[PDB]
Amino acid sequence: PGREILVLHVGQGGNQIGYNFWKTICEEHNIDIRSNQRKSVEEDKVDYKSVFLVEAPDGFHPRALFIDLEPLAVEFLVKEMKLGSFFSEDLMVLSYSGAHNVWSIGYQTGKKLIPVILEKIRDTMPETLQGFLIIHTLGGGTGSGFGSLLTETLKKEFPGKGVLNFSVLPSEVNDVTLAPYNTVLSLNHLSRFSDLVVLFDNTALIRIVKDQLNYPVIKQFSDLNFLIGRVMASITASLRFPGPLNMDLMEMAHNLVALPETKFIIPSVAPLTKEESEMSTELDLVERCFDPTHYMVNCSGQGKTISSVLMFRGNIAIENAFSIMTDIKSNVAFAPGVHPDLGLKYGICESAPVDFDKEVTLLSNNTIISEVFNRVLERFDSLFNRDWYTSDYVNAGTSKSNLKEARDNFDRIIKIYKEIEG
């Protein structure tokens, strides 16, 4: 036993993303998410299902908790996707009142549910658990505030285990006017308590779906969240399937986090379609990953890479993987202090994602985060300097001084990234 991970889904976005993640994980392991059973013995592959899946005599179950302060997003999702026997009731921690898009309400109200969450974790977690993934949006109130509280709680309650966040930033025009407050408060908390924060935003995700997958229409978030699930699944594939070069969660974090504060990561994946996977080279896929068209955070350009992790999945020519390294280092901009021989961390897994020939996933620690975060800060200041929308933060235990303290620590992180940029 070992390497087990527990996934916490928080708020509407966090749980809706959970559907796509768990659908992907079950598909990769030949598990029928509706029967809880292997689809067949003959197509059962040599693998390590226990990373994300709990095998019981009756079948397989997600090592997950489904957490929200209001019940509708989760209940409607479970009904629509027919997930009742997989997202089972004993894995849900739901209240009734909602956070009303205020981080502070999410944080305060979430405290009441922490005892039940810790008891559920300690009831079923193996002692060799390697860590936790928290899936949440930052612009609402529950994912942001309760998600922040959970990050703090787990890091305090389980020292020595990894806490990783998969976190959705607001879109280029925010669709929650309070999102700058919720985002600054969340990123301040994750800077204090997370080990690694992998970021996404819907402007980038919509651009990828319309321009790389050419979907005619996006009617449900499941036709966006699949990209987040793909990143989550591919970066953990070498924990779950054979391959020449495997890597675990903190191995990836250690290679990425050059200074303690630089833990905010931009992900990308290539190719997005099966047809492209059959007509591309390792070099072509890596170049796509390093191109802003494939970044899952909306960026103005390539930025400067401090450190990166590349996962090669599937039908990979190892000599191409290694020989293109000088080309990556020459063609992609890296931060001034990065030695020509450094800044790359490789995993190589023999398992391709569903029906693809091969796939590359990139996690980049990139100075361009400063531009992304500065835009959040500019939005924050436009509200805070006018004292707009602060009342319900103050009423729920976040004083105006506290908001300012979170802003100023956020700015300090931004300046660290900008300084590395040169």
**Quick one: CA torsion of 374, 376, 379, 384, rounded to 10 degrees?**
-100
> In the complex, what is the shortest distance from the CB of residue 270 to ligand GTP, in angstroms, rounded to a whole number?
20
> In the complex, what is the shortest distance from the CB of residue 106 to Na ion, in angstroms, rounded to a whole number?
9
- Supply the angle between the helices 179-193 and 400-421 in degrees, to the nearest 10: 70
CB closer to ligand GTP out of 108 and 238: 108
81 lies in the site for ligand GTP, by CB under 6 A: no
CB closer to ligand GTP out of 73 and 420: 73
* Strand, coil or helix: 239: helix
In order, the DSSP letters of 278-298 are: TS--HHHHHHHHTSTTTBSS-
Residue 415: how many other CB atoms lie within 10 Å: 14
CB closer to ligand GTP out of 144 and 277: 144
| Burial environment of residue 88 by CB neighbours within 10 A (0 to 12, 13 to 18, 19 or more) | middle
* Strand, coil or helix: 56: strand
> In the complex, what is the shortest distance from the CB of residue 174 to Na ion, in angstroms, rounded to a whole number?
14
Footprint of ligand GTP on 139-198 (CB under 6 A): 139-143, 168, 170, 175-176
Footprint of ligand GTP on 293-312 (CB under 6 A): none
CB closer to ligand GTP out of 153 and 351: 153
**Residue span binding ligand GTP (CB under 6 A) among the ranges 11-19, 184-192, 255-263, 324-332:** 11-19
77 lies in the site for ligand GTP, by CB under 6 A: no
98 lies in the site for ligand GTP, by CB under 6 A: yes
343 lies in the site for ligand GTP, by CB under 6 A: no
CB closer to Na ion out of 142 and 307: 142
> In the complex, what is the shortest distance from the CB of residue 91 to ligand GTP, in angstroms, rounded to a whole number?
17
**Residue span binding ligand GTP (CB under 6 A) among the ranges 23-31, 77-85, 98-106, 400-408:** 98-106
| Burial environment of residue 330 by CB neighbours within 10 A (0 to 12, 13 to 18, 19 or more) | exposed
Nearest in space to 396 (alpha carbons), one of 10, 111, 93, 118: 111
Tell me, what amino acid is at 22? Answer: W
Tokens representing 329 are 């280092």
**Which residue among 4, 12, 248, 398 contacts ligand GTP (CB under 6 A)?**
12
**Which residue among 137, 238, 365, 398 contacts ligand GTP (CB under 6 A)?**
137
- C-alpha 99/C-alpha 384 separation (Å) is 20
> In the complex, what is the shortest distance from the CB of residue 70 to Na ion, in angstroms, rounded to a whole number?
5
**Residue span binding ligand GTP (CB under 6 A) among the ranges 21-29, 217-225, 288-296, 299-307:** 217-225
Residues found near Na ion in the complex (CB under 5 A): 12
> In the complex, what is the shortest distance from the CB of residue 43 to ligand GTP, in angstroms, rounded to a whole number?
31
Residue with tokens 């070992």: 2
Tokens representing 244 are 């020449």
CB closer to Na ion out of 16 and 191: 16
Q: How many residues bind ligand GTP (CB under 6 A)?
A: 24
Interaction partner, residue 253 (Na ion, ligand GTP, none; CB < 5-8 Å by kind): none
Q: What is the β-pairing status of strands 305-314 and 162-169?
A: unpaired
> In the complex, what is the shortest distance from the CB of residue 202 to ligand GTP, in angstroms, rounded to a whole number?
5
CB closer to ligand GTP out of 213 and 283: 213
- C-alpha 223/C-alpha 231 separation (Å) is 15
> In the complex, what is the shortest distance from the CB of residue 322 to ligand GTP, in angstroms, rounded to a whole number?
35
**Which residue among 36, 130, 167, 225 contacts ligand GTP (CB under 6 A)?**
225
CB closer to ligand GTP out of 170 and 303: 170
Tell me, what amino acid is at 272? Answer: L
> In the complex, what is the shortest distance from the CB of residue 411 to Na ion, in angstroms, rounded to a whole number?
28
* Strand, coil or helix: 26: helix
109 lies in the site for ligand GTP, by CB under 6 A: no
Nearest in space to 292 (alpha carbons), one of 280, 302, 282, 278: 302
Kindly report the CA angle at 120 between 115 and 123, in degrees rounded to 5? 120
Tell me, what amino acid is at 223? Answer: D
- C-alpha 192/C-alpha 292 separation (Å) is 28
Nearest in space to 3 (alpha carbons), one of 354, 237, 308: 237
CB closer to ligand GTP out of 21 and 290: 21
Nearest in space to 178 (alpha carbons), one of 114, 106, 110: 106
CB closer to ligand GTP out of 175 and 378: 175
Tokens representing 299 are 């960026």
Could you list the residues that contact ligand GTP (CB under 6 A)? Answer: 11-13, 16-17, 69, 98-101, 137, 139-143, 168, 170, 175-176, 202, 221, 224-225
